[PDB]
Amino acid sequence: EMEKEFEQIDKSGSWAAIYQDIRHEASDFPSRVAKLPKNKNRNRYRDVSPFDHSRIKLHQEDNDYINASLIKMEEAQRSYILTQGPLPNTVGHFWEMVWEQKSRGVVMLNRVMEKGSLKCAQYWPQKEEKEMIFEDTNLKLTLISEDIKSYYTVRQLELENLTTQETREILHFHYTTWPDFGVPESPASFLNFLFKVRESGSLSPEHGPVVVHCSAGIGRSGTFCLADTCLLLMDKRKDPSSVDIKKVLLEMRKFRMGLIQTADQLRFSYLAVIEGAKFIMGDSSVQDQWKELSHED
Ligand SMILES: O=C(O)COCc1ccccc1
Numbered sequence: 001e002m003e004k005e006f007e008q009i010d011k012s013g014s015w016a017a018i019y020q021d022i023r024h025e026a027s028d029f030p031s032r033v034a035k036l037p038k039n040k041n042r043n044r045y046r047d048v049s050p051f052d053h054s055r056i057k058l059h060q061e062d063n064d065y066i067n068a069s070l071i072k073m074e075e076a077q078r079s080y081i082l083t084q085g086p087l088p089n090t091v092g093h094f095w096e097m098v099w100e101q102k103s104r105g106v107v108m109l110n111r112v113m114e115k116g117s118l119k120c121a122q123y124w125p126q127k128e129e130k131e132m133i134f135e136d137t138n139l140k141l142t143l144i145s146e147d148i149k150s151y152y153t154v155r156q157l158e159l160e161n162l163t164t165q166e167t168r169e170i171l172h173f174h175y176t177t178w179p180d181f182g183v184p185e186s187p188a189s190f191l192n193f194l195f196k197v198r199e200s201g202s203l204s205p206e207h208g209p210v211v212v213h214c215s216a217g218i219g220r221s222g223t224f225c226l227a228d229t230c231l232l233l234m235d236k237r238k239d240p241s242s243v244d245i246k247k248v249l250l251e252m253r254k255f256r257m258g259l260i261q262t263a264d265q266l267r268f269s270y271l272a273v274i275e276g277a278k279f280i281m282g283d284s285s286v287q288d289q290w291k292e293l294s295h296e297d
Helices: 002-011 015-025 037-042 091-101 187-200 220-237 245-252 263-280 286-294
Strands: 055-057 065-073 078-083 105-108 132-134 139-148 152-161 167-175 210-213
Touching: 002 015, 002 263, 015 245, 015 263, 037 065, 055 065, 065 091, 065 220, 065 245, 078 091, 078 220, 091 132, 091 139, 091 152, 091 210, 105 187, 152 187, 167 187, 187 220, 187 263, 187 286, 210 220, 220 245, 220 263, 245 263, 263 286
Parallel strands: 078 210, 105 167, 105 210
Antiparallel strands: 065 078, 132 139, 139 152, 152 167
């Protein structure tokens, strides 16, 4: 059981050690398309590349490349697209991907500016009456509504294919107090946010995969997918002992490198799953408590 593994590693202070063994066991696959010279300005970081086997391809003949990976968790029947924060020049590619993959939700785990630097382009409209047109990909995006909580925001966007005049409603879930290379306040507000995404239908098999991003799409994004998948597997098995977090993480790392970027993100992941297990095992009331301790009011 993970709760006892947690106490062992915590008492022995072995997190940096567990983390390094995950690093050493992690898959390595070619990322040849990412490293082509014509794709240099489509990557936010030179050392974070999608693997060729799991990369999302854009449906445009010129250049199909985006820094995005499909994570497919077969047993949990969950799939996620993990991507970098879009660049000024890839905002159009980002929304094209959302359109082509039939995603219903975008989960953003960073602020546009962190530590006095830009982590992401402003890729959605700030005001209802000021819509965004992406000329390169022939898409229009309108802000429909915005609901602000203390530490996260939920926006209703309308995405229109200008080529075909079809429109879709996209939900933008913006977690607004998660530091880069860091961990949420307590897992409470984290979990509260995760259960909000689930409640929306965005993670449901009726829709294309949810798009998840932070700055590089591996750290904070990794922590989101790892907690969701572990809780689901727990749910499907009704057995907290049967879930090995370290094995699930290594499976996900077959699809995108570097998921979980620090030993404290690994520790937080355990803490999020352990706390979340209360709910999965039948204490439905624990969800009301999370809203309270989150102070989302
Ligand atoms: O904490 C995160 O979610 C992402 O980490 C930033 C990063 C890590 C490695 C390489 C480039 C950027």
